[PDB]
Write a protein that binds this ligand. Structure first.
Ligand code: NAG
Length: 380
């Protein structure tokens, strides 16, 4: 390829601070905006290798039929491999009433319906991601429609299986004009465990124009290294060690690294940066130390440097507040959410400069010089 041989491992890696977005595994420095495409491809391979498992490509069979009852469409999808194995699933779409825009409705793919308010001119697709890969506990490993296609021992984590499903949904929408969706204006959202999922979807599926993870916490927009710092200093956060025993959001291989995080040549600031140069705003809640609040702020601050280096800082937002229940939406943040939806899904001239925290981090502080070691280059 134009990126040469993509690295999927870095055996000698050992860095207690955040991995540098702007240096390839081979030591080459990023210099151009085009370099970011290759670096993102390498980050994708590293994340798959160390924590996410293998993301399969589009299978040889993908078919879709559509029917509509009232304002509810049903998109019946079939996916199949060359060995004849197939699975089927049928997300529903809730439409705004009346005549759609020329190019169809903008759409947000909402994991299990999401927990954000979706404005009136945007359609909502409800993605039953738990059916694609189960997520009750460690007991759920290898269970779900995805594994009925690829096998229950396939390395994909549940979140990687969910991403695969989103990619098939977008495949189906592109081949189904009667769904009346503008496939150039698709967003994705989810809250809590499904916010972890939504971030993975936006990172790995480049056809998503806007990514909105809501209270995703550890394994979402928090960084593993920063959460280890938090837990060592007395905040009762979720961390890498606990999360792999709690559920199946990560590959089994990640168990080999959760006690050796400095040897992992990525962290979730690079996961989030895989969305660049597309748009993302994530929302966090400081009321629950489980979500690892300092870790999310520092992690997204580090991710933000990639957008800054690409000259598109305002395509990446972060808003972190307290004072509300988990996955309840505070009206105080509706303007920030709507700014990103209006700009990136509704083609309005909305400004999207949102990068705010209350710094309510408990027993630690954020010290950027202790975690971010790189200067930000102006990619050309
Ligand atoms: C370093 O790796 C990147 C990513 O594969 C590649 O684009 C670049 O050309 C490599 N450097 C050299 C000197 O081959």
């Amino acid at each position: 390829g134009a990126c040469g041989a993509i690295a999927s491992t870095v055996p000698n890696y050992n860095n207690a601070k955040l991995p540098d977005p702007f240096t390839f595994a081979n030591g080459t420095a990023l210099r151009t905006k085009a370099d970011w495409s290759c670096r993102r491809a390498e980050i994708s391979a590293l994340i798959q290798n160390y924590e996410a498992g293998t993301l399969p490509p589009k299978p040889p069979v993908v078919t879709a039929s559509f029917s509509k009852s009232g304002n509810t469409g049903t998109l019946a999808i079939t996916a199949g491999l060359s060995n004849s194995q197939t699975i089927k699933f049928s997300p529903t779409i809730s439409y705004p009433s009346g005549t759609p825009p020329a190019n169809g409705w903008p759409l947000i793919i909402a994991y299990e319906g999401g927990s954000i308010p979706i404005p009136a001119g945007v359609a909502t697709l409800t993605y039953s991601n738990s059916d694609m890969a189960q997520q009750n506990s460690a007991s759920s490993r290898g269970q779900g429609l995805f594994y009925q296609l690829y096998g229950s021992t396939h390395s994909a984590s549940a979140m990687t299986a969910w991403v695969w499903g989103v990619s098939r949904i977008i495949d189906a929408l592109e081949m189904t004009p009667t769904a009346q969706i503008n496939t150039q204006r698709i967003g994705v959202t989810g809250c809590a465990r499904d916010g972890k999922g939504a971030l993975m979807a936006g990172a790995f599926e480049e056809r998503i124009a806007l990514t909105i993870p809501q209270e995703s916490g550890s394994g979402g927009d928090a960084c593993w290294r920063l959460s280890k710092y938090e837990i060592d200093n007395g905040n009762q956060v979720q961390d890498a060690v606990e999360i792999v025993g709690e559920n199946v959001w990560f590959s089994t291989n990640f168990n080999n690294y959760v006690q050796k995080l400095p040897t992992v040549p990525e962290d979730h600031h690079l996961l989030a940066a895989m969305v660049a140069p597309r748009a993302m705003i994530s929302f966090e809640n400081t009321d629950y130390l489980w979500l690892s609040p300092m870790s999310s702020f520092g992690c997204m601050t580090a991710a933000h440097t990639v957008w800054q280096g690409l000259g598109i800082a305002d395509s990446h937002g972060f808003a972190q507040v307290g004072g509300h229940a988990h996955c309840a939406w505070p009206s105080s943040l509706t303007p920030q959410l709507n700014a990103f939806i209006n700009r990136f899904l509704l083609d309005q001239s909305a400004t999207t400069n949102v990068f705010t925290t209350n710094n309510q981090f408990g027993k630690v502080q954020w010290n950027a010089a202790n975690w971010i070691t790189w200067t930000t280059p102006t990619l050309t």
